[PDB]
């Protein structure tokens, strides 16, 4: 029942504007992520999280397969 | 660029093609393995089997060569390596299609990467986790594919990494049928090429220099017949390092850097080669996948950028 | 904090305003309607942020929108809003 935690991966995202005091998550559709943030001056804006590709494998048929760090779906670039 | 949804309930950690290219297996963080096939009629990916495999998040799977049958490895954080063989007489999408074979518990650490050997060394296997110890598993008995015996055990790091500090491990085998057995092993900021000596035990043969930060992907370029071999390195920096390894301890071998591109402005997560070692697909932190080819010179130049 | 009232910019009866936050970080442009007392008359139109630490501000009456913005480092960032 007890799970000994350990850090697997660290993902760095730069905000749109600097000097941010606090932030908060936004639950998006299709397991997306956006960050609503409040600056040191109290201005509130919205910083989206980029869809960073996790794995880009090639193929014998020259087909590219793309997997993302955020959502579930897998992108495929066929050769036709 | 048509997308298909894998149907996982969590993150997708590793996707690998099979030998023929018509099958993909997608491991995930919801302790499931889903195997997809390519229908020749509908021309769309469809699920073949989905089953709960491990007790933690699965981070690496790898297909075995089809001369050994349909065997899928699976390394996860619960310190287990589970090997799955497909039953031909079983229903589609049932969960009992892939039969469990072995659970290698010799590793006292959460694993990161599993890689099958090429089709000239045997039915070997490699594993690396947060323990600093490399483990090789050979299936020496062709009659039954369940007596997976540990044969080599080399320590890579002096101590296991800390609980909180992040670290990555990746493996890449050398698919040359006419060269001594080599293994490209990445551990944190170190990338080492092992080699099978005359005594049957691996030794440190050559170390790739550089690598100021964490190594996220090592891919050995397929030995198409050239006199030089290539290793692609995706570091936590922007650097996609390509190393030209020339071989001439049976044989001495030299490591020379061929190219070093900062064309991503972030962490390079996955770098992978083609069938012939001509197209290099690098995915980085900018959200764009950059393809690389060599034109009129040995130095690799950039090409089409997919975002 | 600096609220500077600017005229000769609106063809209507509204009066343009230029505001600097008390932390001296942003410049905000307004159009205030005098005939309604409620706070909905203060219309926040535009905001340009991350101007270091603003130490002064001015406006050009000849052409609409030319709002000079100074800083502590020394940069006299002169730009346009309207």
């Amino acid at each position: 029942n007890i799970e000994n935690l350990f850090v697997s991966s660290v993902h760095d995202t730069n905000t749109m504007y600097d000097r941010v005091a606090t932030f908060d998550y936004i639950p998006r559709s299709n397991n997306g992520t956006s960050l609503i943030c409040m600056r040191q001056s109290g201005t509130i804006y919205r910083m989206p999280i980029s869809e960073v590709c996790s794995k880009a494998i090639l193929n014998n048929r020259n087909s590219l397969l793309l997997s993302n760090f955020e959502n579930t779906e897998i992108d495929e670039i066929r050769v036709n | 660029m048509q997308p298909f949804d894998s149907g996982h309930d969590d993150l997708v950690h590793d996707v690998v093609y099979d030998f023929y290219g018509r099958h993909v297996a997608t491991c995930s963080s919801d302790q499931h393995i889903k195997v997809f096939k390519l229908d020749k009629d509908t021309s769309n990916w469809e699920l073949s089997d989905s089953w709960r495999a491990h007790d933690s998040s699965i981070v690496a799977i790898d297909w075995a060569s089809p001369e050994y049958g349909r065997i899928i490895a699976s390394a996860s954080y619960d310190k287990t390596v589970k090997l799955w063989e497909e039953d031909p007489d079983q229903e589609e999408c049932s969960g009992r299609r892939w039969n469990k074979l072995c659970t290698l518990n010799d590793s006292k650490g959460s694993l990161y990467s599993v890689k099958f050997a090429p089709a000239h060394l045997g039915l070997k296997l490699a594993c690396l986790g947060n323990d600093g110890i490399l483990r090789l598993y050979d299936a020496l008995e062709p009659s039954d594919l369940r007596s997976w015996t540990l044969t080599s055990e080399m320590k890579v790091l002096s101590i296991p990494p800390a609980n909180h500090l992040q670290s990555d491990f990746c493996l890449s085998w050398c698919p040359s049928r006419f060269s001594p057995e080599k293994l490209a092993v990445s551990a944190l900021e170190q990338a080492i090429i092992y080699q099978r000596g005359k005594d049957g035990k691996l030794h440190v043969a050559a170390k790739l220099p550089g690598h100021k930060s964490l190594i996220r992907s090592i891919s050995w370029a397929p030995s198409i017949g050239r006199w030089y071999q290539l290793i692609a390195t995706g570091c936590k920096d922007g650097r996609i390092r390509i190393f030209k390894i020339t071989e001439k301890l049976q044989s001495n071998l030299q490591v020379e850097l061929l190219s070093e591109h900062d064309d991503h402005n972030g962490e390079v997560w996955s770098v992978s080669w083609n069938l012939t070692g001509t197209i290099l697909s690098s995915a980085g932190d900018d959200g764009k996948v950059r393809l690389w080819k060599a034109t009129y010179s040995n130095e690799f130049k950039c090409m089409s950028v997919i975002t | 904090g600096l609220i500077k009232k600017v005229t000769h910019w609106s063809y209507d009866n509204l009066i343009d305003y230029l505001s600097v936050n008390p932390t001296r970080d942003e410049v905000t442009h307004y159009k205030v309607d005098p005939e309604n007392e409620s706070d909905e008359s203060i219309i926040k139109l535009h905001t340009v942020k991350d101007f270091g630490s603003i130490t002064c501000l001015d406006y050009s009456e000849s052409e609409i929108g030319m709002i000079g913005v100074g800083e502590k480092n020394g940069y006299l960032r002169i730009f346009n809003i309207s």
Side-chain angles (χ1 to χ4, degrees), chain B residues 49-102:
Chain B
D49 196 34
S50 168
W51 70 98
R52 188 196 163 170
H54 292 243
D55 296 343
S56 285
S57 74
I58 306 166
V59 297
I61 54 182
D62 199 76
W63 286 79
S65 180
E67 47 194 57
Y68 294 99
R70 303 186 71 104
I71 307 183
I72 292 185
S74 48
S76 51
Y77 283 161
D78 60 344
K79 314 137 80 177
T80 58
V81 180
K82 286 174 185 203
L83 295 173
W84 304 79
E85 200 264 338
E86 163 169 347
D87 213 12
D89 48 356
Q90 200 60 253
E91 298 183 2
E92 294 275 327
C93 316
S94 66
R96 322 181 311 178
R97 183 76 182 269
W98 290 79
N99 277 114
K100 189 172 181 289
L101 290 190
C102 199

Side-chain angles (χ1 to χ4, degrees), chain B residues 223-261:
Chain B
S223 177
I224 202 70
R226 304 183 277 255
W227 73 292
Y228 61 98
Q229 281 322 294
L230 298 176
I231 288 183
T233 306
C235 183
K236 206 207 176 191
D237 293 331
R239 274 87 191 263
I240 313 155
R241 273 178 206 83
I242 294 164
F243 294 95
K244 207 197 87 171
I245 297 90
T246 310
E247 194 190 15
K248 58 175 298 308
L249 282 72
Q250 201 174 356
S251 55
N252 45 356
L253 78 171
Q254 41 183 355
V255 167
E256 166 196 2
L257 185 70
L258 187 150
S259 77
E260 176 188 2
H261 311 125

Side-chain angles (χ1 to χ4, degrees), chain A residues 17-19 39 41 43 45, chain C residues 21 23 25-26 49-50 52:
Chain A
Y17 318 101
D18 293 0
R19 278 175 187 173
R39 299 202 40 183
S41 75
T43 318
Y45 67 96
Chain C
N21 53 6
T23 181
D25 279 344
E26 82 192 4
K49 311 170 66 184
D50 296 332

Side-chain angles (χ1 to χ4, degrees), chain A residues 5 10 55-56 62 72 74 78, chain B residues 4 6 43 166 272 274 281:
Chain A
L5 291 185
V10 169
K55 181 67 66 68
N62 266 329
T72 311
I74 315 295
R78 302 217 192 171
Chain B
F4 72 104
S6 47
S43 311
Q166 74 160 352
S272 77
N274 213 23
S281 78

Side-chain angles (χ1 to χ4, degrees), chain B residues 11-174:
Chain B
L11 297 183
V12 186
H13 279 262
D14 208 305
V15 181
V16 288
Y17 267 107
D18 68 321
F19 189 70
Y20 304 143
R22 273 185 175 162
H23 276 88
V24 298
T26 65
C27 85
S28 63
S29 198
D30 64 336
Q31 63 203 359
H32 279 64
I33 297 175
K34 292 184 172 38
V35 175
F36 300 93
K37 69 166 157 180
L38 201 60
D39 198 9
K40 212 180 174 178
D41 286 330
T42 69
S43 311
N44 213 13
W45 291 98
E46 58 184 359
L47 190 145
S48 170
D49 196 34
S50 168
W51 70 98
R52 188 196 163 170
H54 292 243
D55 296 343
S56 285
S57 74
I58 306 166
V59 297
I61 54 182
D62 199 76
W63 286 79
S65 180
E67 47 194 57
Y68 294 99
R70 303 186 71 104
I71 307 183
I72 292 185
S74 48
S76 51
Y77 283 161
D78 60 344
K79 314 137 80 177
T80 58
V81 180
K82 286 174 185 203
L83 295 173
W84 304 79
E85 200 264 338
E86 163 169 347
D87 213 12
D89 48 356
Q90 200 60 253
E91 298 183 2
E92 294 275 327
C93 316
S94 66
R96 322 181 311 178
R97 183 76 182 269
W98 290 79
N99 277 114
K100 189 172 181 289
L101 290 190
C102 199
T103 309
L104 313 161
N105 305 312
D106 306 324
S107 172
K108 317 179 185 309
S110 293
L111 281 75
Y112 279 89
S113 51
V114 56
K115 275 299 171 205
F116 268 112
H120 81 279
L121 283 166
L123 194 50
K124 297 179 46 65
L125 188 140
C127 292
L128 198 54
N130 48 13
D131 213 14
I133 316 173
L134 181 63
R135 276 165 182 89
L136 298 200
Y137 298 90
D138 307 357
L140 302 169
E141 278 98 357
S143 59
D144 61 357
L145 308 168
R146 290 180 275 136
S147 61
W148 279 80
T149 62
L150 189 139
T151 51
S152 177
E153 206 173 346
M154 301 285 313
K155 216 181 200 307
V156 181
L157 304 161
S158 73
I159 46 166
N163 201 10
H164 45 95
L165 289 175
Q166 74 160 352
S167 64
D168 214 5
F169 302 95
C170 187
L171 296 146
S172 200
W173 283 90
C174 166

